Every structure is written in C-alpha cells, then in structure tokens.
Amino acid sequence: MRLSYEALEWRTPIENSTEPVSLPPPPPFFGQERAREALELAIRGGFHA
Amino acid sequence: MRLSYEALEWRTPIENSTEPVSLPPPPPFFGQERAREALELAIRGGFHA
Amino acid sequence: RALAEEAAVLGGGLLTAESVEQAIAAREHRSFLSEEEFLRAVQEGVIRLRTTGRAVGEVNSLVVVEAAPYWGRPARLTARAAPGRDHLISIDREAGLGGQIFHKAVLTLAGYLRSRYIEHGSLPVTISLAFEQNYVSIEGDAAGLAELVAALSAIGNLPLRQDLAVTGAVDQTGKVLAVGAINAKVEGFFRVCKALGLSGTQGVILPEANLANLTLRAEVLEAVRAGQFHIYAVETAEQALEILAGARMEGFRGLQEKIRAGLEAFARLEEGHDKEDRE
Amino acid sequence: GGQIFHKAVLTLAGYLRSRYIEHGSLPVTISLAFEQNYVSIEGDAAGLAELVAALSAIGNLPLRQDLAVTGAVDQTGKVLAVGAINAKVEGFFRVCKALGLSGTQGVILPEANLANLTLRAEVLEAVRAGQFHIYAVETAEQALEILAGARMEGFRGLQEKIRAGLEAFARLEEGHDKEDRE
C-alpha cells in the first residue's frame, strides 16, 4: 500500500526563523533521567558507579 | 492447569509500614550452621580449613 | 546490605517499606534501557509480536537476552513443515556452523517426534525452526517447549493461541523441565503485553517445576488477581499444546487426530511424488 | 562455501518448501546472484528481494523494475525491519533521479520501518509531487503482488502461476527420470 506524503512527512514545520531564540539552560542530564537518578544515588550514598 | 492468584502470591503480608523495630544481633553464621560448625571444628582442632 | 544502603539513601536514613520498594524499583530501572528500547520498538511496530488471536506454527517463546543484565522477553518462534526425509532443522542453531553438530536439542525434539508418532517409517516431514528477530541466543543444551509445540502445530496445521507465551524445556518423553529465570521471562512477557495493552486473556505457559520458583513482581501478581493475566503450569508438552490449541489431545476432533492427519498428508505427497517420478 | 548453511538460505528454502507444496520436494533449484559486487550481502538475514526474485523466476512473473525491494523475511513470509532504511531509499531515489524520473519509480519497504522513515527533503518533495512512491508491506505476498501487478488469489493469480511453474519443472524432472530409468 502506497504511503502518502502526509504519512511520510516527519519534519517539524517552521513558523518563523528571523527571531533568535533565547532559552534557559537545560538541567544537567536532560532527557537522561536514568543517568541523573543513578548519579544522584551514587553521590548521596558514596557508591562506586 | 491455570494457577490462581492465591497459588502465586508469595509476598508476606505487611501489617504496618511505620514502626521502628528492634531485634537482637544474630549469632555469627546465622543460617550457616554448616560453615559455623566446620569453622568451630577447624578452630578447636587447629586444622587448616 | 547494598540494597539496604540504597534504600536508606532514598529513604533519608530510615528503611521504610516505601523506601525499600523505591530502592528495588530504582535498581531494576537502572538496567532497564535495553527493555525500554525493546518495548519502544514493539510499540512502534519495528518488532511485531502477536499478543492477540491465533496463528499456525507460531509461538511467543520467552527468552533471556545476551546482555549482562538478565531480562526476559518474548520472541516469535516459527516452525515450518515440509515433505521429505526425517530431518529437523534448527535455523538459529545451524546459522553459521552446519554439518549436523548434534546440538542435543535437535536430537531431543527429533527423538520425541519420531517415537511419539509412529504410522510410517522415517518421519515424513522436515521441520525448520527459526526465531523472528535476532536477540534470542537460543540454548543448545536444552530443547524448548515452544519449539515442540510450534513443530506440532506446523505438522498438524494447528492454530495456537498467540495470547499465551510458551516457556520451558522438554526431553524426549515430553515432560516439561524447569528452566532458569522464569520470573524474568514472565515479567518480560507481561511488560510486552502491557505495552501493547492487556486484552484480559494474555498469559504464560510455564513448567510446573518452576512453580516453586515463581517469585513474581507485584504488578504481575496484581494483574493475575484482576484476571488480566494468566499463568498456566504444565508437566507435559501434550497439555501445553492442549492449552494453546484450545482442545484435547484425544477424542473426536482431537489434536492427535489432526497431527496424524497432517503426517499422513505429507507421506501421501511423498508417495505421489515417487509415483510421478517413476512414470 | 562448504558447511555453514547460512541463515538466509535456510530461511528462503523453508519458506519455499513449506508454502508451495504439491510434491515430496521442491522441484526447482534457485540460483540467486547480485550483479556487480559491492553489495555486502548479509548472511545472517534473508531478503525480501531475494524471495520475490525467486518467486518470479519460479512463476515467470514479470516484476516491475520501477520499484526497488528492501526488507528481510522469515520462513513465514513476514517482512522484517531492516537497518538504514533511509540510506537505501535515498540511494534508490538518487539512482532514479540520475537516470531521470518517470513518475512511477518507488521503493517497497517493510511497514516495520515506518517508525524509522525520516527521509531527506528531496525524496519527500518527490513523493509529494507524485514522482516517487513508497510502499509498505507486511508479508512477502504483498510485495510480490505489488511487483507483479496481480493478486495472489482469484483467476489468473500469482499463486496458480507459481504453482504451474513448479508443476512444469516437476514434469521436466519426471520426464528426465523416466528417460534415464529406461
């Protein structure tokens, strides 16, 4: 069955590009909650990691 | 045959989750009476173990 | 003591039940990346496993992954029967060696199939056993119950339930032997079913020798109590096939009748080919 | 190439010997080859292209050369996901564009790779304009139906064509055996 363009389109639509973005820095290990939690536990408990 | 929940439940029931408990220290090699007796024999007889 | 230390860290110093279960959950989740990737692939359709309806010659064999952490997960085991000499091919055991290595798992399944069904001479079927996707690391020492039930379904054109995953080892007698890491396999299948959505009929067929080893997680047991997940304990491959195919081995419209009918059909194709070659 | 027995050859042989059954054995020998050697063929996985090519050879089915076929299959015939789907689709698009697009070229890729389908801008624009097509298949039968432009069931279907090809090969074998016997 043929896949239409809408079913294949994956790119994020750009609404504007003349404005320079100003965003706050992300927390360390962003999108890496597992690693952040493991390191939190290792630091708080003094565990070799 | 199909195993029921009561034939699969293995966790012991919890009466309470907030009440600190005090227990006497267990004797050395608790549940290890074989190793404890072997070491007792080795120490009393001077045997290499 | 290490788990207690982790619970104290997550509990602030006091090891409450909540703190200990949090420590256990965190320890389980810290090595959960492989299972997270597998579940995401299953949900996205990259790895398509059947957890509803029925299929012929296909089972959800529970396996343990190659990774150092021991995570159970289902893999689609497929068996295909063709007319010919009595020769059972384990495709994922002859993938790169060849030459009849005598894997002791092909020998066991071949012995069961040759001794159990005797209406001709050499078995009139050749069985090809394979795993869809390659993470299984199939054990060579012990033949699988899933392999046997898939071979029987392929021979007899038996639609087996895809709801139930099949795990366990079998010898030539048909008795299902205990397998290690039964909890991991059951929990992996339950994770897959929950990711795909529980239909209230998915379950696991596991050896009754592992009943003393079923220390299942809280979530799986809660599902079992609610009736959304079932656990079947079997002693022989015959009753596992009965549970999968939803009918009895003996009697009218039995499983033995269908399997012997399939074997007779393959033998008839053999003899018709011989006659056509002769004339 | 002694021993080993591969996993692709065993998979294709199992599918062919189980799906098409009128004699005690498959009456054909299938020789699969790639033209030029830059392929880096995977010995651990069967190919959907290999299976459809074998089926076309058996049944004398004219496959569309417009469509490129990628994807792995098991002995059931289920088309499995394959790595680097974007690279393969974009490479076939580059080849078609270099030779000139006719508005009918396309790629037959597993539906398991729709999660992995992040195509370049040019390929997506061509698909939007209708100059390039993408087909998602669940089983090798669907891929063969798309390639041969015919259904697997009904009058003059691909199933009966492949079965008639095997029957003709079996007739040749039995005639040769009868001649050699006497």
Kindly identify which residue of chain B lies nearest to residue C240, measuring between CA atoms: B1
Q: Provide the 10 A C-beta neighbour count for residue C152.
A: 30
Residue D182 lies in a domain: no
Residues of B at the C interface (Cβ-Cβ below 8 Å)? 1-3, 5, 7-11, 14, 17-18, 20
Between CA C262 and CA C154 the distance in angstroms is 9
Q: Provide the 10 A C-beta neighbour count for residue C222.
A: 13
Cβ(C78)–Cβ(C146) below 8 Å? no
Phi and psi torsions of D109, nearest 5°? -125, 150
Domain count, chain D: 1
Q: For strand C58-64 and strand C72-83, is the pairing parallel, antiparallel, or unpaired?
A: antiparallel
Tell me the two tokens of residue C131.
């795993």
Experimental method used, please? Answer: cryo-EM
Mutating which of A5, A10, A14 best tests the D interface, going by the most D Cβ atoms within 10 A?
A5
Q: Tell me which H or E stretch contains B4.
A: none
Can you state the angle between helices C106-116 and C145-156, rounded to 10 degrees?
A: 40
Residues with Cβ within 8 Å of D43's Cβ and at least 6 positions away in sequence, in order, are C96, D4, D6, D7, D8
Beta-bridge mates of residue D107:
D68, D134
Tell me the two tokens of residue D139.
């089983």
Residue D181 lies in a domain: no
User: Could you tell me if residue D25 is left (phi over 0), alpha (psi between -120 and 50 degrees) or otherwise beta?
Assistant: beta
Q: Do C128 and D10 touch (CB under 8 A)?
A: yes
Q: What is the resolution of this structure in A?
A: 3.0
Residue D180 lies in a domain: no
Tell me the two tokens of residue A20.
């320079």
Helices (H), C76-204: 106-116, 145-156, 182-196
Residue D162 lies in a domain: yes
Query: In 3-state terms, chain A is what percent helix, strand and coil (to 5)?
Result: 35, 0, 65
Residue D84 lies in a domain: yes
For residue C96, the distance in angstroms to the closest alpha carbon of chain D comes to 4
Domain holding C134, by residue range, is: 31-272
Residues with Cβ within 8 Å of D122's Cβ and at least 6 positions away in sequence, in order, are D93, D97
Between CA D50 and CA D72 the distance in angstroms is 9
Q: Do chains B and A touch (3 or more CB pairs under 8 A)?
A: no
